[PDB]
Scaffold this active site. Sequence first.
Site, PDB file in Angstrom:
ATOM      1  N   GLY A   6       5.513  -1.275   1.866  1.00  0.00           N
ATOM      2  CA  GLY A   6       4.499  -0.226   1.845  1.00  0.00           C
ATOM      3  C   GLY A   6       5.159   1.142   1.919  1.00  0.00           C
ATOM      4  O   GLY A   6       6.223   1.268   2.531  1.00  0.00           O
TER       5      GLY A   6
ATOM      6  N   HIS B 237       0.807  -1.206   0.000  1.00  0.00           N
ATOM      7  CA  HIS B 237       0.000   0.000   0.000  1.00  0.00           C
ATOM      8  C   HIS B 237       0.854   1.276   0.000  1.00  0.00           C
ATOM      9  O   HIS B 237       1.910   1.333   0.648  1.00  0.00           O
ATOM     10  CB  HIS B 237      -0.968  -0.019   1.188  1.00  0.00           C
ATOM     11  CG  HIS B 237      -0.293   0.125   2.509  1.00  0.00           C
ATOM     12  ND1 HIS B 237       0.298  -0.952   3.137  1.00  0.00           N
ATOM     13  CD2 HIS B 237      -0.163   1.212   3.298  1.00  0.00           C
ATOM     14  CE1 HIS B 237       0.810  -0.478   4.265  1.00  0.00           C
ATOM     15  NE2 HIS B 237       0.582   0.825   4.391  1.00  0.00           N
ATOM     16  N   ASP B 238       0.404   2.271  -0.765  1.00  0.00           N
ATOM     17  CA  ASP B 238       1.010   3.608  -0.873  1.00  0.00           C
ATOM     18  C   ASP B 238       2.362   3.612  -1.586  1.00  0.00           C
ATOM     19  O   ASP B 238       3.054   4.636  -1.560  1.00  0.00           O
ATOM     20  CB  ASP B 238       1.110   4.317   0.506  1.00  0.00           C
ATOM     21  CG  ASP B 238      -0.205   4.315   1.274  1.00  0.00           C
ATOM     22  OD1 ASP B 238      -1.193   4.821   0.748  1.00  0.00           O
ATOM     23  OD2 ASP B 238      -0.238   3.787   2.389  1.00  0.00           O
TER      24      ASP B 238
HETATM   25  C1  LIG Z   1       3.368  -2.922   5.945  1.00  0.00           C
HETATM   26  C2  LIG Z   1       4.058  -3.040   7.249  1.00  0.00           C
HETATM   27  N1  LIG Z   1       3.663  -2.640   8.442  1.00  0.00           N
HETATM   28  N2  LIG Z   1       4.653  -2.999   9.322  1.00  0.00           N
HETATM   29  C3  LIG Z   1       5.580  -3.568   8.589  1.00  0.00           C
HETATM   30  C4  LIG Z   1       6.847  -4.170   9.044  1.00  0.00           C
HETATM   31  N3  LIG Z   1       6.699  -5.622   9.002  1.00  0.00           N
HETATM   32  C5  LIG Z   1       6.075  -6.294  10.134  1.00  0.00           C
HETATM   33  C6  LIG Z   1       4.573  -6.241  10.075  1.00  0.00           C
HETATM   34  C7  LIG Z   1       3.872  -6.297   8.878  1.00  0.00           C
HETATM   35  C8  LIG Z   1       2.489  -6.231   8.861  1.00  0.00           C
HETATM   36  C9  LIG Z   1       1.808  -6.106  10.056  1.00  0.00           C
HETATM   37  C10 LIG Z   1       0.381  -6.014  10.076  1.00  0.00           C
HETATM   38  N4  LIG Z   1      -0.776  -5.910  10.112  1.00  0.00           N
HETATM   39  C11 LIG Z   1       2.499  -6.045  11.251  1.00  0.00           C
HETATM   40  C12 LIG Z   1       3.881  -6.113  11.260  1.00  0.00           C
HETATM   41  C13 LIG Z   1       7.195  -6.407   7.960  1.00  0.00           C
HETATM   42  O1  LIG Z   1       7.038  -7.615   7.878  1.00  0.00           O
HETATM   43  C14 LIG Z   1       7.958  -5.668   6.903  1.00  0.00           C
HETATM   44  S1  LIG Z   1       8.396  -6.782   5.550  1.00  0.00           S
HETATM   45  C15 LIG Z   1       6.904  -6.967   4.584  1.00  0.00           C
HETATM   46  C16 LIG Z   1       5.673  -6.428   4.919  1.00  0.00           C
HETATM   47  C17 LIG Z   1       4.582  -6.646   4.098  1.00  0.00           C
HETATM   48  C18 LIG Z   1       4.705  -7.385   2.935  1.00  0.00           C
HETATM   49  C19 LIG Z   1       5.924  -7.929   2.580  1.00  0.00           C
HETATM   50  C20 LIG Z   1       6.999  -7.710   3.420  1.00  0.00           C
HETATM   51 CL1  LIG Z   1       8.546  -8.356   3.017  1.00  0.00          CL
HETATM   52  O2  LIG Z   1       5.279  -3.647   7.256  1.00  0.00           O
END
Ligand SMILES: Cc1nnc(CN(Cc2ccc(C#N)cc2)C(=O)CSc2ccccc2Cl)o1
Lengths: 255, 252, 255
Positions: free
Chosen positions: C136, C118-119
Site C-alpha cells: 500500500g 490501496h494508494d
Molecule cells: C497495508 C498494510 N498495513 N500494515 C501493513 C504491514 N503488514 C502487516 C499488516 C497488514 C494489514 C493489517 C490490517 N488490517 C495489519 C497488519 C504487512 O503484512 C505488510 S506485507 C502486505 C500487506 C498487504 C498485502 C500484501 C502484503 Cl505482502 O501493510
Amino acid sequence: MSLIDPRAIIDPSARLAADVQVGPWSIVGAEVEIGEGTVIGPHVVLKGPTKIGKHNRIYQFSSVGEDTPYKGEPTRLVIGDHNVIREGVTIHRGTVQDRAETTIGDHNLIMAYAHIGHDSVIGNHCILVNNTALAGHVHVDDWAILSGYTLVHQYCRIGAHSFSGMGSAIGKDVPAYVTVFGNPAEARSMNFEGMRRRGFSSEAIHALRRAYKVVYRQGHTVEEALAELAESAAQFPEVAVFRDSIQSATRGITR
Amino acid sequence: MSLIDPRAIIDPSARLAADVQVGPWSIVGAEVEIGEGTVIGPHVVLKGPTKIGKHNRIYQFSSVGEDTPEPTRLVIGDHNVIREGVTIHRGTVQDRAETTIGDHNLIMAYAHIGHDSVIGNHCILVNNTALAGHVHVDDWAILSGYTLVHQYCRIGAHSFSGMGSAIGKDVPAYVTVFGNPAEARSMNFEGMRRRGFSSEAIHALRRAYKVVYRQGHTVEEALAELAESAAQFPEVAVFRDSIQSATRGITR
Amino acid sequence: MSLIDPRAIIDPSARLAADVQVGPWSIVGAEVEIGEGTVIGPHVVLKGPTKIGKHNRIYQFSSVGEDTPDLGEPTRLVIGDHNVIREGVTIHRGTVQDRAETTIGDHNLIMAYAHIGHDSVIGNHCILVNNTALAGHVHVDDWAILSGYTLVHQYCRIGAHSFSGMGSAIGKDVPAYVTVFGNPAEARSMNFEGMRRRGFSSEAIHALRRAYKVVYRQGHTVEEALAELAESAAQFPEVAVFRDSIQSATRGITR
Ligand SMILES: Cc1nnc(CN(Cc2ccc(C#N)cc2)C(=O)CSc2ccccc2Cl)o1
Ligand SMILES: Cc1nnc(CN(Cc2ccc(C#N)cc2)C(=O)CSc2ccccc2Cl)o1
Ligand SMILES: Cc1nnc(CN(Cc2ccc(C#N)cc2)C(=O)CSc2ccccc2Cl)o1
C-alpha cells in the site's frame, strides 16, 4: 432482489438462518450450516461438514471447507462470528474423532489467498495478511498478526499478540508478544505497538521487556529462563502468557 | 443430473469422453480433448489446443491451457489432481517444447506451471509453487509450499525443496534444497525408504552425495569418481546423469 | 453474438463505451467506467468508483476496485490504456481527500495473482510478475520489472527501469535502474540490459555505471553522493532520474 441470489446453488441438506445472503454463482454445499447476518459473496465455494457463525463476510473465489489433498471418517470446519474471509482464501476441514477439527474463532481477518491447512486452530482478533499459509495443525492464539506471505510449518504454535514480518518462514514456535522476521524466522523483539494498542500498563510493558531479555539476550537455557520468569509471571498475567507459550513449546522456540 | 452441467460452456470442437463430468459455470474451449473418468469442477477455464487424459480431477478457479503472456499445445496425462486456482500455460509444438504433465501428479492450490515446462510422474507441487518456464521436473520430486523455480532449471528425480525455496540452478536427483537462494543440504533418504530402495543403494547414494559436495572436487572430478558406482547402481546413475545434464550448474 | 454476454451483471450506474466486451458471469459494479476496446474476461469482479481506460484486458477471477480490508470516505481507482491484468489479480481503491487514489498508467503487465494495495501508483511500461505484492502507498516508476513473488513494504518507491529478483522482500526505496535480490532485498548492480533495450547511449550507460559506484562502492553518505552526482545529472537526463530517486527516498535506499 432475493437474499439468496437465484443463480446460486443451495444444497437441500444445507441449513441457513433466514437473513443469510448468498451472491450469484456461489455453491453452498451439502452439510454447510450458516448463521444469522452472514454474507456470502458471488463465486464462492462452500463445502461441508462446515459451521459458519453469525455476521461473517466471505468474498469471491474462496474455497471454504475443502478436503485435505479411511472412507467416511467425519471431518469438520467451525468458523465463529464477525470474521472477514477475503478473495481466494482456502480453508480445509479437520478430523473430529481426535478433537483436531479446523477451528476459527471470532473477529478474525483472513486476507486474500491466505491458506488454512487441515486441523489448524485460529483464535480471536487475528490477522492473516495476503498469502499467509498455515501448512496444517497450526495453532494461532488471540491478536496474532502474520504479515503477507508468512509461511508456517506444520505443528507450529503462534503466541498471543505475536507478529511476523512479511515473507517470514516459521519453523519453530513463536512465543506470545514476540516479533519474528526472515526465512528462516528469527526473533527480533516484542510487539510493544500491539501492547500499547491493547492499553497495557507501563509496569506490564517493562516486565515483558525484561522477560524477553531473560529468554533471548542473557544467554540462559529454556529451563533456566522459565525458572527465573516464575516471580514475574506471578505478579503480571501478561508475563504468565509469555511464560506459558515457552513452557508449552514442542518444536522449540523461534530464536 | 447430467454429467455435463447445463450451466457450463462447451465449445462444439471440444471432444469429451462419454463419462466426463463438468461442473457449473466452467468453460471448455475449442480444441480441448478430455479423456474417460476426468472430473472438471465448477468455475474452471480450459483453453486449447489441450489434451487431458483419463481420471484427472481439476478444481475450481483453475486456468488450464492459457496462452503465454504457431500451433501450441498442453498435454496432461492420467490420474492427476489439479487443485484450486492453478495456472497452466501451453508450450510451442514446432520446437517440441509443448507443456507436458505426466501421470499421478498432485498440483496444489495456486501453483503455476510456466510455458514449455515438463513434469514427470508422481510429482508433488505444493501450494503456490511457481515454475517460471522451460522447467523440467523429473519423477517423484516434491516442491514444498511457495517454491520458486528460475526458467530452464531442471529438478531431479526424488529431489525435495523446503518451503519458500528460490531455485536458480539445477537440483540433482535426490537432493534436498532450502532457502533463498536455494542451498543443497542432504539427500531425501526418507523418500528412498518409501520407494523401497535397498540399504546398499541408499549407502551408495549417501557416498555419492559426499563425492559431489563434501570432498572439494570439481564437477568434472566428481563425475569421473561416480562412474564406477553408477554402472553398479541404476539409482546412482540417475544421480550422475542429473549432474551431467546440468546446464545452469548445480545447487550447492 | 453480443459484446456484453447476457450472463454478465452490468450495474445501471456503470458507464461503458459501445464496444466494451464483457464475458459470462462477470460483475461490472456501481460507479465503474470502461473505455473503448477494453475486454473483460469471464468471472471478473469490477467494483467502483473506478475508471478503466482504453484497450485494456482483464482476465478471469480478478477483483479490480475493491476496498482495502481496513479503513463514508470516497475512494477511487484509475487505470489507463493498453494494460493487461492477468487472472486472480487484486487491485484496491485509494482515498481522494489526501490525493492518494490508486492509479495505474499505460502499457502495464500485471501478472497472475499480483496484489496492488490501496494508494499505490504504477507508471507506464511496468511488469509486475506473478504474485508480486504492493502492501500500500507504493510508487512504481516507468519500466520497472518486479520478478515473481516480490514483496514491497508500504510507502516504498521503486525507481524507473529498476529490477527485483524473484522472491525479493523490499523494505527500503529502490533507486532508478538498480537491481535488487533476496529477503531482505540487497542492491547488486544496475539494469544495463534494460538500458540497452531502451536505446540509451554508451555515454549515458557509462555515466550510470559511475553513478552506482559513487552511491554504493565508495563509502559516501547519501548527502556526499548526491553532491558528487550533481554535475553528471545536469548533463545526462538518465543520471538526473537516478539522482532524483535517491533524493526522494523517505525510507533510505536499498543497499
Ligand atoms: C497495508 C498494510 N498495513 N500494515 C501493513 C504491514 N503488514 C502487516 C499488516 C497488514 C494489514 C493489517 C490490517 N488490517 C495489519 C497488519 C504487512 O503484512 C505488510 S506485507 C502486505 C500487506 C498487504 C498485502 C500484501 C502484503 Cl505482502 O501493510
Ligand atoms: C500438510 C503437509 N504435509 N507435509 C507438509 C510439508 N510440506 C511438504 C508436503 C506438503 C503436502 C504434501 C502432500 N500431499 C506433501 C508434502 C510443505 O510443503 C510444507 S509448506 C505448505 C504445506 C501445505 C500448504 C502450504 C504450504 Cl506453504 O505439509
Ligand atoms: C517467464 C519468464 N521470463 N522472464 C522471466 C524472469 N522473470 C521476470 C519476468 C517475467 C515475465 C516477463 C514478461 N513478460 C518479464 C520478466 C521472473 O520473474 C522469473 S520468476 C517467475 C516468472 C513467471 C512466473 C512466476 C515466477 Cl516466480 O520469467
